[PDB]
């Protein structure tokens, strides 16, 4: 039933906007957070801005929410496979995630963010997953989504 709503927007600006919403909260929790955009990351793109924003906001937001100390990095780059694949990696410094808990992370229902993000990523012909090296190692949430180049 779901359908992409396409328009042209500045992808770089979208990342800075997300960081601007999250930063004051990171500051209160004393979690340094960094954004890195690859030198070849397209600027003006065609895609569904409000759905892309929802995905990035919930994953970056989760990093802040579930981290008690340490830093967070948000990295945006291109996955080579007109269109391209945007990759976003969000690495936090949480307590880590047990292997048994990862396969059910998109279906854990308290909490709706990742379930919604998964549908949006699927709409953009993409892939999303979370991984953790275990105790004390935080986790990385990663997604690839297809976007048009303006």
Please check whether residue 62 is in contact with residue 94, taking contact to mean a CB–CB distance below 8 angstroms. Answer: no
Instruction: Give yes or no for residue 14 binding ligand ADP (CB under 6 A).
Output: no
Nearby residues of 38 by Cβ (< 8 Å), 6 or more positions away: 75, 76, 77, 78
Look at the alpha carbons of 143, 144, 145, 149 in this order and tell me if their dihedral is positive or negative: positive
Q: Which residue has the tokens 């979208």?
A: 14
Residue with nearest beta carbon to Cl ion: 94
Q: Which residue has the tokens 């929410």?
A: 65
Look at the alpha carbons of 33, 38, 42, 43 in this order and tell me if their dihedral is positive or negative: positive
Instruction: Give yes or no for residue 139 binding Cl ion (CB under 5 A).
Output: yes
Residue with nearest beta carbon to ligand ADP: 111
Would you give the binding string for Cl ion spanning residues 88-107, x where CB under 5 A is met? ------x-x-----------
Residues between 112 and 131 that touch ligand ADP (CB under 6 A): 112-115
How many CB atoms are located within 10 Å of the residue 105 CB? 16
Instruction: Give yes or no for residue 138 binding Cl ion (CB under 5 A).
Output: yes
- 98 beta partners: none
- Binding partner selected for residue 113 from Cl ion, ligand ADP, none, CB under the kind-specific 5 to 8 Å limit: ligand ADP
Least Å distance, CB 89 to Cl ion, is: 14
Alpha helices in the chain (DSSP H): 11-29, 49-66, 113-123
Instruction: Give yes or no for residue 141 binding Cl ion (CB under 5 A).
Output: no
* Both structure tokens of 142: 């990663």
Instruction: Give yes or no for residue 139 binding ligand ADP (CB under 6 A).
Output: yes
Instruction: Give yes or no for residue 47 binding Cl ion (CB under 5 A).
Output: no
- Indicate the annotated binding residues for ADP: 62-65, 92, 108, 110, 114
Query: Can you say which residues are annotated as belonging to the binding site?
Result: 62-65, 92, 108, 110, 114
Q: Which residues bind ligand ADP (CB under 6 A)?
A: 58, 62-63, 66, 92, 94, 97, 105, 108, 110-115, 139, 141
């Amino acid at each position: 039933s779901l359908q992409l709503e396409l328009g042209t927007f500045n992808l770089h600006t979208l990342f800075r906007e997300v960081l601007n919403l999250i930063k004051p909260i990171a500051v209160v929790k004393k979690l340094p957070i960094t954004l890195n955009l690859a030198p070849d990351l397209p600027e003006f793109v065609v895609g569904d801005e409000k759905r892309l924003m929802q995905i990035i906001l919930n994953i970056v937001g989760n990093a802040v929410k579930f981290s008690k100390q340490g830093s967070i990095s948000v990295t945006a780059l291109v996955t080579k496979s007109s269109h391209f694949y945007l990759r976003v990696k969000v690495k936090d410094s949480g307590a880590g995630i047990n292997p048994q808990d990862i396969p059910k992370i998109f279906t854990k229902f308290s909490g709706l963010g990742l379930a919604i993000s998964k549908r949006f990523v699927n709409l953009m012909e993409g892939n999303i997953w979370i991984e953790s090296d275990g105790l004390g190692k935080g986790c990385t949430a990663i997604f690839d989504v297809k976007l048009g180049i303006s």
